[PDB]
RNA sequence: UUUUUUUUUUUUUUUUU
RNA sequence: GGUAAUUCCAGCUCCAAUAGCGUAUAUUAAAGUUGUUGAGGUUAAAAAGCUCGUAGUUGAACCUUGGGCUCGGCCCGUCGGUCCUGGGUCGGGCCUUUCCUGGAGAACCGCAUGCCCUUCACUGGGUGUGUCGGGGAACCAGGACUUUUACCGUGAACAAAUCAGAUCGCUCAAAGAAGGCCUAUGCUCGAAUGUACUAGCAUGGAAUAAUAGAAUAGGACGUGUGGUUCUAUUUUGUUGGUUUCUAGGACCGCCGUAAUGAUUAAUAGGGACAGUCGGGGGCAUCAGUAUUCAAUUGUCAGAGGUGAAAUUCUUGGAUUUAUUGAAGACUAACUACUGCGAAAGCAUUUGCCAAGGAUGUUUUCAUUAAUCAGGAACGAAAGUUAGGGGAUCGAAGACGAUCAGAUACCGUCGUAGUCUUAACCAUAAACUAUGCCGAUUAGGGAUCGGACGGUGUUAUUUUUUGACCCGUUCGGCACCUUACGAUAAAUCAAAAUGUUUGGGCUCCUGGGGGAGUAUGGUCGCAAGGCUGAAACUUAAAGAAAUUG
RNA sequence: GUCUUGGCCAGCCAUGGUGACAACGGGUAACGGAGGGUUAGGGCUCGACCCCGGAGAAGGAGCCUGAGAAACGGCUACUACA
């Protein structure tokens, strides 16, 4: 309910109150402040390219015991450094030091998904070749 | 009760309820005549007089105000108008 | 309830339905207005005038007896007080607190009441200026309160 | 502070109706209240209502027949266009053939169905069904 | 009404006349 | 998924969509998780510590109603005329105290004729009309008299394209505005219609919501009379050039006309008056034991303290006994499901100072009111500055115990503080975790203050008052049973009158953390207060009950 | 002075104008709109972009011709680039 005004000439109070209280809405606040353009590792884009700096292993969260294979990637467009998960069995062999890879979102809206702590991006393509294509017997990694 | 004729309540109820809460706020006060001892003059006094009323020319106190009701001086007869 | 207290107490006077003088009054409207003028000329406030007429002379309601309220009678006869009753008693009360507050400085309860008393004066004087009883430039000032009451 | 004497009358009416009482005392008296009562009485949703005269705002005693589901006011009195009656009726009434939305138009206090006949509109002030 | 600290990770249940 | 993997890698089989399918990001619905419709605030996040108060929002009732005469449209029935009927609704005029100039045409009163009629004047004519005359009317055009805003109805105007939507067999369809008919000669329908919120323009409606009107009458009214002043259509010629009456505008007299002019007094509010009521506030004052210390006093070995001890004091008489004095703090028992105060808070006596609610009222004013963004007063304890005081208790500190340790709980000391004057600070689980105003709704008994009525004891009394008893009522602190209701539940007479959802106002909350943190501002002597994020992280955190 | 009105500009005089109904300042990853998407109603969001209006031609300024330009597939000057 609430003690909202109910006069016939209280539209200004009703609009001002709604504008103030709408900031507490998490999704409106994210859009209104433009945090994707400001603080997101991407510039608000769906994908981004970067250079693989090294291969790191991430221990899975409880209850789960495994080493998730990941790579430290420095984005070309802005220089920010992120960690990208390498999906599928044995796909870490395709990725190597100083490769050019394309990253995408990993799940839902920048939040880490699954038992991988602190990893919020995934590798899509390596050297212009899809990771799934490399993982299957479909395409060949560039000769370089 | 689910069925009351509120238009015409009992006169006993009227004397029971508050002076404002009745159907029509009839005041519970009255005007009254004081006969002072030793003289034959009639002075009209409010039932709830807030002042020490003295008769016209007799130089005698007729009532003392206290607690929202005049207390007549002893030795005086009264008759409600 | 009360404007400056919790105070949800109902207590008033119930005017009778008659609107007509009762049969036991044999006084002329000319006589009672002469009584009103004599009392007001002495210095009685219109609130005080009604009390003495009702308690001693048996006038239940001056308006019922005559047709005009006491203040409108006084203004017509040119004996209305320069300052209204409501402000005069409120300003006189505020002056009383000042003389106590000057002597007693630790009385923070008296200090709080003075704010309430002053707030009623400002709200009241705002109403009088709206209807035209007081000049629009009339202002209640702390140190000038005693001068007005005298 | 009293702000809507119309709401006080209808709230008192509805409280007595839900309690099963066959009558209710209404204070104070207003032209809107009497006209609003007469709209009830024409459709039979109430019975006799009697106004007690006084040298102040009057009182009303309404005799209830028990065929009264809900009566309520609308605050504020929204300005309603002719195209807006159907939306107001749909969103506020039961099925659109029992209840009656009360408006105030230049023709006076009158029903939503009567507005469709007279092709007039105004301000919504109450309802019943 | 003397005092008595601690217990390594995960693992502990499903359908109808 | 830990050696029987329906979830990984594969083989087989099957399912969904299919020339498509998956993935990442943005946005919409779901989301009554942004709530105007339409959220939540006792415990899940959330009523500012409390009061005053400006802007804002909202604001008691009251002024032409009732009846009748009618006339017309539409709808609901039977009459179906060719293959006229009642009721309901809506609208129009009249009665019931309810615009002139020129009228070009209107029209009432009789009309030039005309119409019927009591036997009461005969008739064959004349459309458009002239005059006497014109209560009420559309017509043009000049002027006067209209309270003003909000609101609703209608109308005009209001690029295409888009959208909704009509038509046509692009082979259907998305589309497009085409096409169709006659054998031909050439003949023709189309290329519709709706949509203009809010602002602007014109008119009507007059309820609802506002505002003015006559009160020091400086008020209204003329075929009333008299002045001052200003202007000028016309006559014998003269907006140039003035010189009389006279026709209009302003102001001011005397007389008359008139029902001559002010709505209530809200179980709204303010003020006044009377007797009470209170541990409400300030100042000074008085008493009380107790604690500590000291003096005198008699005694001898222990006394304190603990679960048990020890530190500690003690033949210099400790502890204990009696008397007295000093100091400072405090106000026991009485003391309560009692009272006062806005809250924080407030308990010995007396005097003074100012204030307050309730009650009673046939006193007064008459809307003066409610809530409040910023703004302001007060605001426990702790803490700060400068003096005074410093009995007790006691942060810090020092020891003695316990313990593995014991920087603690326990015991002996003990500084700041605890008390007070002047000035700060402005926070509390500042809690009823429950904002303020208003109305209504089930019963009952206690209790406090006031008032009223009755009764009988008791003390006084030229029969009043106090105590006790019963009842009524107003206003409080609460409580007991119940659910016609509410909630998720515990529980609630409010947390009820809410999916049958709108009485007024203010404030706060939007999963858990990060975080009441960083930064900027402002207040403070400082401690800090107020305002107040984001990155990042996470699938729960949490509320009430249930069985173990 | 301008095609013309105008504090548009030059002289003289006065002290005003706006603001809590949010002026002024800041941000926009803001050209405005007709409109696109999605919605029972109430709404949310997007609109550089086939149409209408505005502005610009590496960044400012100035100007000729001309009815019409502060034009840039015109000129002049400065900065950067070449
Ligand atoms: Mg309103
Ligand atoms: Mg899990
Ligand atoms: Mg009240
Ligand atoms: Mg208030
Ligand atoms: Mg005020
Ligand atoms: Mg344990
Ligand atoms: Mg350990
Ligand atoms: Mg441990
Ligand atoms: Mg919610
Ligand atoms: Mg909690
Ligand atoms: Mg909470
Ligand atoms: Mg509170
Ligand atoms: Mg108002
Ligand atoms: Mg005292
Ligand atoms: Mg001794
Ligand atoms: Mg007491
Ligand atoms: Mg005592
Ligand atoms: Mg008093
Ligand atoms: Mg707090
Ligand atoms: Mg709280
Ligand atoms: Mg209430
Ligand atoms: Mg009681
Ligand atoms: Mg009593
Ligand atoms: Mg109480
Ligand atoms: Mg949320
Ligand atoms: Mg949160
Ligand atoms: Mg629990
Ligand atoms: Mg831009
Ligand atoms: Mg751009
Ligand atoms: Mg140029």
Curated annotation (Swiss-Prot), chain A:
GO terms for biological process: translation. It is found in: Cytoplasm. The modification Hydroxyproline is found at residue 63. GO terms for molecular function: structural constituent of ribosome. Pfam families: Ribosom_S12_S23 (PF00164). InterPro entries: NA-bd_OB-fold, Ribosomal_uS12, Ribosomal_uS12_euk/arc. Component of the ribosome, a large ribonucleoprotein complex responsible for the synthesis of proteins in the cell. The small ribosomal subunit (SSU) binds messenger RNAs (mRNAs) and translates the encoded message by selecting cognate aminoacyl-transfer RNA (tRNA) molecules. The large subunit (LSU) contains the ribosomal catalytic site termed the peptidyl transferase center (PTC), which catalyzes the formation of peptide bonds, thereby polymerizing the amino acids delivered by tRNAs into a polypeptide chain. Component of the small ribosomal subunit (SSU). Mature N.crassa ribosomes consist of a small (40S) and a large (60S) subunit. The 40S small subunit contains 1 molecule of ribosomal RNA (18S rRNA) and at least 32 different proteins. The large 60S subunit contains 3 rRNA molecules (26S, 5.8S and 5S rRNA) and at least 42 different proteins. This is Small ribosomal subunit protein uS12. It comes from Neurospora crassa (strain ATCC 24698 / 74-OR23-1A / CBS 708.71 / DSM 1257 / FGSC 987). The lineage of its organism: Eukaryota, Fungi, Dikarya, Ascomycota, Pezizomycotina. The gene is crp-28.
Swiss-Prot record, chain B:
Gene3D superfamilies: Zn-binding ribosomal proteins (2.20.25.100). InterPro entries: Ribosomal_eS27 (IPR000592), Ribosomal_eS27_Zn-bd_dom_sf (IPR023407), Ribosomal_zn-bd (IPR011332). One of its GO terms (molecular function) is zinc ion binding. Its cofactor is Zn(2+). Its main location: cytoplasm. The keyword Transferase does not apply. GO terms for biological process: ribosomal small subunit assembly; translation. GO terms for cellular component: cytosolic small ribosomal subunit. A zinc finger (C4-type) spans 36-58. It is found in: Cytoplasm. Disulfide bonds: none annotated. Binds 1 zinc ion per subunit. Pfam families: Ribosomal_S27e. Keywords: Cytoplasm, Metal-binding, Ribonucleoprotein, Ribosomal protein, Zinc, Zinc-finger. Component of the small ribosomal subunit (SSU). Mature N.crassa ribosomes consist of a small (40S) and a large (60S) subunit. The 40S small subunit contains 1 molecule of ribosomal RNA (18S rRNA) and at least 32 different proteins. The large 60S subunit contains 3 rRNA molecules (26S, 5.8S and 5S rRNA) and at least 42 different proteins. Belongs to the eukaryotic ribosomal protein eS27 family. Component of the ribosome, a large ribonucleoprotein complex responsible for the synthesis of proteins in the cell. The small ribosomal subunit (SSU) binds messenger RNAs (mRNAs) and translates the encoded message by selecting cognate aminoacyl-transfer RNA (tRNA) molecules. The large subunit (LSU) contains the ribosomal catalytic site termed the peptidyl transferase center (PTC), which catalyzes the formation of peptide bonds, thereby polymerizing the amino acids delivered by tRNAs into a polypeptide chain. PANTHER family: 40S RIBOSOMAL PROTEIN S27. This is Small ribosomal subunit protein eS27. It comes from Neurospora crassa (strain ATCC 24698 / 74-OR23-1A / CBS 708.71 / DSM 1257 / FGSC 987).
UniProtKB/Swiss-Prot annotation, chain D:
GO terms for biological process: translation. This is Small ribosomal subunit protein uS8. Belongs to the universal ribosomal protein uS8 family. Component of the ribosome, a large ribonucleoprotein complex responsible for the synthesis of proteins in the cell. The small ribosomal subunit (SSU) binds messenger RNAs (mRNAs) and translates the encoded message by selecting cognate aminoacyl-transfer RNA (tRNA) molecules. The large subunit (LSU) contains the ribosomal catalytic site termed the peptidyl transferase center (PTC), which catalyzes the formation of peptide bonds, thereby polymerizing the amino acids delivered by tRNAs into a polypeptide chain. Its main location: cytoplasm. Keywords: Cytoplasm, Ribonucleoprotein, Ribosomal protein. NCBIfam families: PRK04034.1 (NF003115). InterPro entries: Ribosomal_uS8, Ribosomal_uS8_CS, Ribosomal_uS8_sf. The gene is crp-27. It is found in: Cytoplasm. One of its GO terms (molecular function) is structural constituent of ribosome. Component of the small ribosomal subunit (SSU). Mature N.crassa ribosomes consist of a small (40S) and a large (60S) subunit. The 40S small subunit contains 1 molecule of ribosomal RNA (18S rRNA) and at least 32 different proteins. The large 60S subunit contains 3 rRNA molecules (26S, 5.8S and 5S rRNA) and at least 42 different proteins.
């Amino acid at each position: 309910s609430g003690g909202k005004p109910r006069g016939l000439n209280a539209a200004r109070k009703l609009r001002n109150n709604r504008r103030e209280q709408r900031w507490s809405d998490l999704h409106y606040k994210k859009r209104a402040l433009g945090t994707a353009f400001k603080s997101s590792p991407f510039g608000g884009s769906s994908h981004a390219k970067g250079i693989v700096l090294e291969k790191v292993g991430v221990e899975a969260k409880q209850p789960n015991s495994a080493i998730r294979k990941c790579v430290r990637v420095q984005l070309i467009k802005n220089g920010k450094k992120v960690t990208a998960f390498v999906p599928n069995d044995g796909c870490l062999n395709f990725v190597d030091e100083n490769d050019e890879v394309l990253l995408a979102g990993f799940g839902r809206k920048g939040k880490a998904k699954g038992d991988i702590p602190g990893v919020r991006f995934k590798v899509v393509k390596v050297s212009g070749v899809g990771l799934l294509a490399l993982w299957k017997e479909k395409k060949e990694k560039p000769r370089s | 009760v689910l069925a009351v004729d509120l238009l015409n309540p009992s006169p006993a109820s009227e004397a029971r309820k508050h002076k404002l809460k009745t159907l029509v706020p009839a005041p519970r006060s009255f005007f009254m005549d004081v006969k002072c001892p030793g003289c034959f003059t009639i002075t009209t006094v409010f039932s709830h007089a807030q002042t020490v009323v003295i008769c016209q020319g007799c130089t005698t106190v007729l009532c003392q105000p206290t607690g929202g009701k005049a207390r007549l001086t002893e030795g005086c007869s009264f008759r409600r108008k | 309830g009360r404007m400056h207290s919790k105070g949800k107490g109902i207590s008033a006077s119930a005017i009778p339905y008659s609107r007509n003088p009762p049969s036991w009054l044999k006084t002329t409207p000319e006589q009672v207005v002469d009584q009103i003028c004599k009392l007001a000329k002495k210095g009685a406030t219109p609130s005080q005038i009604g009390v003495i007429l009702r308690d001693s002379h048996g006038i239940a309601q001056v308006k019922v007896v005559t047709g005009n309220k006491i203040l409108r009678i006084l203004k017509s006869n040119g004996l209305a007080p320069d300052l209204p009753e409501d402000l005069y008693m409120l300003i006189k009360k505020a002056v009383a607190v000042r003389k106590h507050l000057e002597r007693n400085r630790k009385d923070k309860d008296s200090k709080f009441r003075l704010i309430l008393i002053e707030s009623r004066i400002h709200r009241l004087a705002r109403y009088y200026k709206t209807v035209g009883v007081l000049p629009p430039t009339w202002k209640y000032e702390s140190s000038t309160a005693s001068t007005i009451v005298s | 502070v009293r702000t809507s004497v119309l709401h006080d009358a209808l709230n008192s009416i509805n409280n007595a109706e839900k309690a099963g009482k066959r009558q209710v005392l209404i204070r104070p008296s207003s032209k809107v209240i009497i006209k609003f009562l007469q709209v009830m009485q024409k459709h039979g949703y109430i019975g006799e209502f009697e106004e007690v005269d006084d040298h102040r705002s009057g009182k009303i005693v309404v005799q209830l027949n028990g065929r009264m589901n809900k009566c309520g006011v609308i605050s504020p009195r929204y300005n309603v266009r002719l195209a807006e009656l159907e939306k107001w009726v749909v969103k506020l009434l039961p099925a659109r053939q029992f209840g009656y939305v009360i408006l105030t138009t230049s023709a006076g206090i009158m029903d939503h169905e009567e507005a469709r006949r007279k092709h007039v509109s105004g301000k919504i002030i109450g309802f019943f069904y």
